[PDB]
Amino acid sequence: PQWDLWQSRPRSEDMDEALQPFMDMPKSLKDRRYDIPWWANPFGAWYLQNILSLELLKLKSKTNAEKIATYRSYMRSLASGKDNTMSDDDVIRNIIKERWKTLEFGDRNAGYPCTFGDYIQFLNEWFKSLDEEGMQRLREHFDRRIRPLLAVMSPVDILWLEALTQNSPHNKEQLQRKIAFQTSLGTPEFFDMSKRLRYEINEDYKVRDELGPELFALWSKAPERWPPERLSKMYGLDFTLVRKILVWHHFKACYDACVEPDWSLPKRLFALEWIRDVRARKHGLFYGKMRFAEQKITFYSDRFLFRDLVNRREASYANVWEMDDPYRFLQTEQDYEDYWGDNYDVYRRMFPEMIGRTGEPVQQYGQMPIWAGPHRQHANKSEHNWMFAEIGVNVGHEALKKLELDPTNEKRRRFVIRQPDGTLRSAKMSEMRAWYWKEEWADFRFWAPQMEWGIENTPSQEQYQEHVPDTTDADFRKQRRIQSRPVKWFYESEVRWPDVI
């Protein structure tokens, strides 16, 4: 059915205790405990009678005026006619404040509303009745309110507060007798710092749980119109903090809705950070960070290096995101999920620069004819992929990996893969690059289509023709063309269509 705070849901008996003394409480006295409603405890009854009733009074009912008349009369008796103009809600708040302050712990039937043991039991059961969200809210309340007081108050002050809570006459007398205990109490002038500390904590919490929904709505509606960088710039927040808030909001929504969180979101918001920082760590081994990816010459050493770097930075994104131009190769949601989920590491380590794809298309070759006929067609099938890569004098140069793996190269390195069914196919980009020395860097800024052209950049035909390529001078080009073009004309020995009448 419906379970809430008013009607406590039935919980399991084997639940662990929340407070420390109940963990050491003996089992017999644990079994002695009854199963009672929350208000059956004297502290719960006191709360329901004093504070919860006044909280309910603000709701629309019939006895509201009847009780408000009495409370207003009491307030007028307290403060002459000044409090007549005070609002009814203000009067209720004042009464609640006074009843909270005048609360005392002592003998149950001697005037005190409830005992310290009853208060401890109520606190323990109230903590037990909380779920994960309840405990999270409890910790939030602790951080908002109690933590500044603890940070600003001395252990002597805490012990004095404990003595006040227990309200033991002899123990209070013993604590007050000590001269050092009298002199070690804190000063209100120093305790005033707790106000500013609490304000700062509440300011951070307000940032989180009030600017999270707004930033989340803006970034979910129009991520390209409101990127995290723009949101941080316009709201004065930290650029990293905005993304952290978005991630936290989405993950908390998933967790409190009992849905598996979108694990791709931290990758999509910290793509650069994910590649840079997230690593697998061994036990007992201390690790370091590479300040620079390689040993290179700085761009300040030469005037041309400086110009090259500034031009590349101009052509480069400051912060690349999921919707930007380099990620336009993820047409459908299948591509989107595949790229951003469980394979982003390999997908980003495949190629350093960001290109309009992740690899190269795979095309399959044709099998050489086998004159043995069907007596040998089976022999090229096996249980494994047989991968072959060309080596030789002209192949295997690490410094020429890009030019050797360029598909538009007539002397491209030749790779073949025989599948377990005999199919001869080409190799993927990662498969081709696996044969060279590994490159373990990435580029998240430079995007080639944004390069400058026209101003200061104009490739000229004169520079290329300075080599003077002449077909009558060198005929290797004609030889390669002859090699490429078909040769079936040689068996016909002007080409003309057949004549049939």
Binding site: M23, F142, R145, L161
Partner: peptide, 28 residues
């Protein structure tokens, strides 16, 4: 190995904070 249950955080609520904070438990 053992997870920190942070049960010592709950012990601070057993101190009658209404005496000094003047009813901080409620909404404010």
């Amino acid at each position: 190995n053992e997870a920190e249950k942070h049960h010592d955080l709950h012990m601070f609520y057993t101190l009658a904070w209404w005496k000094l904070g003047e009813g901080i438990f409620g909404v404010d």
